[PDB]
């Protein structure tokens with residue numbers, strides 16, 4: 001299980017697809033098993049005081065990697081369902097977290113402030129197929145207040161497949177001190193089935209990733225549970241970095257690694273395949289533009 005040279009990778013993808021994606025299934029089953037001999041504690045996620053702070057009862061934040069909120073003058077005011085996740089050759093390049101609940105909006109923005117996060121990647125619509133996926137944690141227009149954090153919508157650009165909102169946030173208890181936070185929001189989600197083409201996602205990963213500023217906190221990435229699409233984004237982005245750096249790809253190895261940092265990152269085989277399609281589009285896209 002070593003890195004694959006980028007020039008062999010698309011051929012590798014052919015092989016994984018063949019015979020009704022038998023190879024993909026092997027890979028992903030291996031991913032899902034890669035935790036079998038690992039007990040990873042999530043005591044805080046399971047504490048009675050924090051239960052209401054978890055969007056899904058089965059989706060937890062591993063203790064060792066969990067993002068800690070600075071405590072408040074409550075023993076469990078430190079908790080949010082969120083984990084640091086490695087990027088390519090970079091520890092804690094991301095915070096992967098659930099779509100925030102109304103009840104955790106203040107925690108959410110406090111984390112962004114405390115972690116010096118400058119970019120949000122939102123990979124879900126608030127509602128999908130009639131179902132509630134995420135609560136709106138930003139102002140529709142002008143300003144909204146969440147605890148000591150006041151968020152102001154400055155500008156929006158609505159593209160075909162995603163939306164960029166530029167906020168300025170201010171901490172009232174500081175002096176206030178103001179930061180730019182940009183939210184990249186992928187908006188194109190089919191009423192039936194799942195997204196079919198990787199190219200628009202590739203473009204979205206490229207632009208939202210290039211927006212990262214030195215030297216800032218980790219990029220915040222969420223969907224609904226903050227594992228499936230969230231994991232998918234992180235692997236694609238990271239592998240694009242590896243390709244740029246070393247002209248090699250290691251999807252299976254990298255994914256098994258980050259699976260120790262938040263449960264279920266890249267949740268389905270179809271997402272796993274999608275990662276490969278995006279990288280394929282990046283590889284084939286070069287040398288032929």
Ligand SMILES: O=C(O)c1ccccc1SCc1ccc(Cl)c(Cl)c1
Nearest residue numbers: 123186194195201232233270271274
């Ligand atoms: O949405 C899913 O669960 C799904 C199921 C099968 C195949 C692909 C997907 S999600 C595809 C996707 C869309 C937007 C972004 Cl930004 C990223 Cl990173 C990945």
